[PDB]
């Protein structure tokens, strides 16, 4: 029934499509991004999404515990997934904090990013219309930098705590608490609006973008590939782990959703249609963003790669500009940020719900019902609030960029995808798993799925992983700022926190199990109830 379809659609369609994909594509020069993007999509993305859903549906266990019924030895995959979601939920909601701040700033006769008579603006401001007539800055960019973000000169300078963004984070976390606690904002007929309006606004933005003068230059930037860049491991990791991010895999959240589905339900077609929806909205909203970028390039007289931030703020530069080019800008500003809030908040609801269902399944003795499950959820939300609050400082953009790069992205996703596919294909067995799928959905996976799990996904993950280490380049925030070495170490700390769960859980399970080593391994390789 459509509870599953709606849960998945609202979960893994979200800010990954509207906000992350455009900025990673822009960061990597546009067209070159799509080749590895589609290679990963059809090699690993859809098959691993189906794999996660099928694990969940087969075991009827949530995220961590399903591996006890498939391969206990590699139970560390579940803990790695859950900690990945723990960090994602910490940093992902800061985007909703920014969206809330923008929305409250929309309630004006004139939008604050339309011109720079305002106080925060540098003396070097030039209103974008007149620039074509020094290091001038656009009001749309420096609203983002100096009012919303109040950007510190570096991560080494935390600066003050933004007392307004703190309450924006508090508001969105309260919304998450009351939605997950009471179960509100799901399964109702109101979902007819909640699931449809965001795509309507995306269509409005796309129609605006494609009609702006200079859109064609942006689309050429978007679709023409410079094969030279591909030589750099950066585009490959960015695209492949953007696939893994956008599909919410390696989180165990999709596995958690699958655990609620009936054992004999045929999910394959639904999974393929949902994947089409996800990758399609990403690719299509690419045309919305890059048309606006081409328009800005034509208006200001600078190359497309120079017009905006090569980073997280790309959406908060581009769409704010677009809504300024429409009748009654305040109306469309409010609608844009309500669309962004709804689209991200359901993906936040799904991710937090998956985290909680995965965690309560470990100890159902406690955490049973509203008498204590509500308190556990409240504790999780409070902790995630205090951690996300670090990104609300003036230096918070650098911390957010470090989180977005390392904590739930990059090699840590490749690691989990590799081990999931490797376990199922070679430790458990493709022959066993295809028979299980035949028992559940009624027909075997077929060769695309079987070989994607057996060879293609492991090969792609290992290739990108090793390629990024042979041709290493460090992180930079906006192509100028270089992180200090301790910040790079912190990013690797975040990534390794997720990755090391597999080795350490393996050793923890080899210990405390009885008997010689051989029987220990054989016992841990054997499923359990």
């Amino acid at each position: 029934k459509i509870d599953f379809v709606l849960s998945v659609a609202g979960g893994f369609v979200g800010l990954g499509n509207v906000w992350r994909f455009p900025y990673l594509c822009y960061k990597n020069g546009g067209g070159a991004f799509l080749i590895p993007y589609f290679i990963f999509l059809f090699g690993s993305g859809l098959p691993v999404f189906f794999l996660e859903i099928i694990i969940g549906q087969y075991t009827s266990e949530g995220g961590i515990t399903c591996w006890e019924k498939i391969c206990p030895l590699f139970s560390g995959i579940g803990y790695a997934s859950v900690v990945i979601v723990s960090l994602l939920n910490v940093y992902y909601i800061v985007i909703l904090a920014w969206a809330t701040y923008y929305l409250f700033q929309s309630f004006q006769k004139e939008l604050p990013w339309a011109h720079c008579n305002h106080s925060w603006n540098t003396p070097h401001c030039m209103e974008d219309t007149m620039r074509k007539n020094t290091n001038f800055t656009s009001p749309v960019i420096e609203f983002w930098e100096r009012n919303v973000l109040s950007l510190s000169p570096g991560i080494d300078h935390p600066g003050s705590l933004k007392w307004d963004l703190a309450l924006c984070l508090l508001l969105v976390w309260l919304v998450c608490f009351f939605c997950i606690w009471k179960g509100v904002r799901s399964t109702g007929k109101v979902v007819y609006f909640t699931a449809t309006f965001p795509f309507a606004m995306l269509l409005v933005l796309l129609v605006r973008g494609l009609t702006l003068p200079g859109a064609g230059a942006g689309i050429k930037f978007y679709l023409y590939p410079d094969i030279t860049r591909l030589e750099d491991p950066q585009v490959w990791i960015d695209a492949g782990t953007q696939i893994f991010f956008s599909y919410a895999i390696c989180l165990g959240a999709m596995t958690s959703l699958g655990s609620y589905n009936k054992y004999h339900n045929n999910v394959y077609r639904d999974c393929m249609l949902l994947g089409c929806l996800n990758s399609g909205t990403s690719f299509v909203s690419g045309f919305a963003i890059f048309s606006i970028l081409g328009f800005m390039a034509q208006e200001q007289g600078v190359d497309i790669a120079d017009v905006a931030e090569s980073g997280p703020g790309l959406a908060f530069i581009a769409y704010p500009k677009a809504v300024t080019m429409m009748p009654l800008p305040t109306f469309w500003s409010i609608l844009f940020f309500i669309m962004l809030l709804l689209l991200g908040l359901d993906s936040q609801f799904v991710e937090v719900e998956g985290q909680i269902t995965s965690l309560v399944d470990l100890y159902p003795s406690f955490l049973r019902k509203g008498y204590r499950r509500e308190i556990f959820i409240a504790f999780v939300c409070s902790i995630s609030y205090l951690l996300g609050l670090t990104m609300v400082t003036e230096g918070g953009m650098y911390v957010f960029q470090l989180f977005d790069y390392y904590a739930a992205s990059g090699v840590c996703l490749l690691w989990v995808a590799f081990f999931e596919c490797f376990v199922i294909a070679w430790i458990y067995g493709g022959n066993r798993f295809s028979e299980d799928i035949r028992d559940m959905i009624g027909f075997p996976p077929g060769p695309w799925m079987k070989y994607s799990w057996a060879v293609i996904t492991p090969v792609l993950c290992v290739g990108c992983f090793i390629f990024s280490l042979v041709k290493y380049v460090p992180l930079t925030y906006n192509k100028t700022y270089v992180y200090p070495n301790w910040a790079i170490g912190l990013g690797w700390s975040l990534a390794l926190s997720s990755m090391l769960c597999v080795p350490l859980v393996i050793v923890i399970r080899l210990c405390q199990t009885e008997g010689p080593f051989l029987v220990r391994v054989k016992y841990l390789l054997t499923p359990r109830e």
Partner: antibody
Amino acid sequence: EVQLVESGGGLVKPGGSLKLSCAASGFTFSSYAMSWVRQSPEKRLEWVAEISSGGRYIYYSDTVTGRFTISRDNARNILHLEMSSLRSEDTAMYYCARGEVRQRGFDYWGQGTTLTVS
Amino acid sequence: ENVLTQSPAIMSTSPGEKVTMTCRASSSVGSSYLHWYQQKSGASPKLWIYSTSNLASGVPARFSGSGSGTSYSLTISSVEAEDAATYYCQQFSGYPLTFGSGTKLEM
């Protein structure tokens, strides 16, 4: 895919035991779920049991679930059905059928063996 | 046990006439999980239609299928002597698997 051939039909006393065989050829027998279907002297079809490709999932009809045991030999491409206590209603034509895909049905049927319990 | 029943248990017919057969289930059957089998007199059955409308490899194109939920049907544009057989519907949605009572076309 070409061929299925049953064997082992014959005459046994009421309450007796009998084992049927069904050889396969022309396809990788280990890759397809297999089923036995039963046709009474009244020509009515009745399903008996299913065994999946790896033999790990087995299903029985409610009228045989306590008395019939299904098994397969992937190393020899032969399918087996064993009846422990044959009731009078169990006399019928027995077909082994290839049923790998539930959305596609029984692709191929054997020639069948008659079972009599006079 | 989902009981399947076919109404026209026997069908007197002559060449050139159109035919439609009915198959009702005691419980709803998914569209992908209902099939029709032909059985010529004195020979083993053969798959005829699957997924409620997809014709098998050997069936002539004159056959067609339809249905949803609790009721299904199979039809012939025009019969011929080669079509004289017993046709069984079968649900494959859940165990025990069950065949319909069968309908025989007499000419």
